[PDB]
A = this chain, B = another copy of it.
Amino acid sequence: VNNTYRSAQHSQALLRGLLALRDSGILFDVVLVVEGRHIEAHRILLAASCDYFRGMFAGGLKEMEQEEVLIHGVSYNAMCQILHFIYTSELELSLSNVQETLVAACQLQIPEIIHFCCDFLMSWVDEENILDVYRLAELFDLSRLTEQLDTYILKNFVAFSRTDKYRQLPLEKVYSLLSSNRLEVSCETEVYEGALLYHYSLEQVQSLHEPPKLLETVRFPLMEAEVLQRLHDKLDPSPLRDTVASALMYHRNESLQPSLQSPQTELRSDFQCVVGFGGIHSTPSTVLSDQAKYLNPLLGEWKHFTASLAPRMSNQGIAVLNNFVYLIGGDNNVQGFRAESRCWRYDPRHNRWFQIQSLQQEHADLSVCVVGRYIYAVAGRDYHNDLNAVERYDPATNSWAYVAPLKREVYAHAGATLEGKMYITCGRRGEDYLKETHCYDPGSNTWHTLADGPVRRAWHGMATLLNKLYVIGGSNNDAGYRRDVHQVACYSCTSGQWSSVCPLPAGHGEPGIAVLDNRIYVLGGRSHNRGSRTGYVHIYDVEKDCWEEGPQLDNSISGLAACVLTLPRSLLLE
């Protein structure tokens, strides 16, 4: 209790001394007189906040070496306002003096006070003072006022469309703002109405003869199919007609929609709230869940979502391509060994669903990584046993493309392509437990040597987090007994070294990779020591290097996987 600390009450003592000196009419070093009115404040705090004011007050003239200080060749009102704002830490503005006060604060290099005043003015801006906001922002050129004005425009464009403010606003700026995928919109009809109001008189709307350039900013494929068809029915021959035809073709060819992507088919919404799909939860019975109810660590609470057309599959392989989550196969050995062939792919970005037919693949409980237009499948099993003959397939073309066969038979194992190279580690060839790890690169179409796991575990899948094999621990009876692995370490096979990563609090093989807010979150699996599924998950980031309590899942489940995707504002609206 004798460590040297840092003084923090010196400023309070200095302010108290300055106030005592000022109240007694002594130690008058800085004096400001405005129209015969005297204002008392502590000059110590004011002179210690910025350097421009200190240099102006004490440049070295005769004013700084006398009881009375005179400022010649300067503006008395601006200097007095700046000094008052710096000393009293308050922004006293009016309906017409807001711009002058903001300019005075900016001249004093006060970011916090100026930003607070600008935010207060924006939040208390009347309709009759609309012209007093844009002009003030243009004249002041504040680093924060422009952003506040842009946010207000983006949030009140709907209200401005009805009023004449939309007409007064620049057309080029409005078009540029609409082009960016950040504006808050509800329906394509509203966007079209806003574009028409920007490109035509508001009174006229309440002229489609001339196709404006800003009309192309509206995403035709993102509109409703019926609405798009109705618009194209009366659409005259023009670039808008071509866009409508392209959108109609994309809608009618939804089977190959991912292969017919266009620059105008981009979404614009959220991106977090990872929503889990599938999986088998022991509580209250072994059934394939079809609801979207997860626990997003970023939000700090359980994720809320509505699963529409969610397939009833457990531990299904999840592959994300073109920002779309696809589920292929999926063993259901929890309720009994039975191979699953039917598979479906969802397209939340396109607001539709696709029934991707799957070919006859002799694999179960296998993970397929879609790298580019081709995919590779590893692990797998025969009809009643495991096998080492791994055959890949391409979901894009439903073709059984040839891939590198597995080095050893894998039972309930997984394999993912790290930096475009499939990796297989641990595993168990039936009763025998495999330990050698082979990283068969899909590009080379052959097996290759890879670094063995730091801990001699079995039935552990291979996952690629941050371009590294972030898998450690594992808990299964294939190691010899139901004994927990007391040694946990992260050995990067790609780098051939024990790269530093976040240690796993619990060891579980075949963990589902889930990245949210740059945090390596792994859940699911079963603990041999506990003799059941693990319902505890921790969301910790090695990069953050912060230890805290991760969100708890709603129920204990196994074989749950998730991926990063853009979520709509409807989920956050509830």
Contact = CB atoms under 8 A, between A and B. Distances in A.
A65 interface: yes
Contacts of A51: 17, 20
A90 B58 contact: no
A24 interface: yes
**Which among A10, A90, A91, A124 has the highest number of chain B CB atoms within 10 Å?**
A10
A54 interface: yes
A24 B47 CA distance: 14
A76 B346 CA distance: 75
Interface string A27-45: 1110000000000000111
Interface stretch (A1-9, A129-137, A510-518): A1-9
Interface string A46-84: 011101001000111000110000000000000000000
A125 to B, nearest CB: 11
Interface string A127-154: 0000000000000000000000000000
How many copies of the chain does the oligomer comprise? 2
B5 A112 contact: yes
Contacts of A498: none
A446 to B, nearest CB: 58
Contacts of A15: 10
Contact of A21 (B6, B18, B58): B58
A354 interface: no
Contacts of A266: none
B26 A60 contact: yes
A299 B344 CA distance: 49
A90 B2 contact: yes
A27 B89 contact: no
B44 A14 contact: yes
Contacts of A18: 44, 48
A404 B31 CA distance: 87
A399 interface: no
A11 interface: yes
A208 interface: no
A270 interface: no
Contact of A89 (B6, B24, B60): B6
A123 interface: yes
A573 interface: no
Nearest to A3: B90
B1 A123 contact: yes
A91 B8 CA distance: 13
Contact of A120 (B2, B10, B116): B2
A187 interface: no
A59 B13 CA distance: 12
A92 interface: yes
Contacts of A58: 17, 20-21, 24, 26-27
A123 B47 CA distance: 39
Nearest to A123: B2
A1 to B, nearest CB: 7
A124 B2 CA distance: 9
A49 B13 contact: yes
A546 B180 CA distance: 43
Contact of A4 (B4, B20, B89): B89
Contact of A2 (B11, B60, B92): B92
A64 B26 contact: yes
A29 B345 CA distance: 72
A88 to B, nearest CB: 8
A65 B28 contact: yes
Contacts of A13: 48-49, 54
A401 B64 CA distance: 93
A134 to B, nearest CB: 19
7 interchain residue pairs of minimum CB distance: A27-B58, A14-B48, A2-B90, A17-B48, A2-B123, A4-B92, A4-B89
Given A2-B92, A5-B116, A24-B60, 8 more contacts: A4-B91, A13-B49, A14-B45, A14-B48, A17-B47, A18-B48, A20-B59, A20-B60
20 contacts: A2-B123, A3-B90, A4-B90, A4-B91, A4-B92, A6-B11, A6-B89, A10-B49, A11-B14, A13-B54, A14-B48, A17-B48, A17-B54, A20-B51, A24-B60, A26-B58, A26-B60, A26-B65, A27-B29, A28-B65
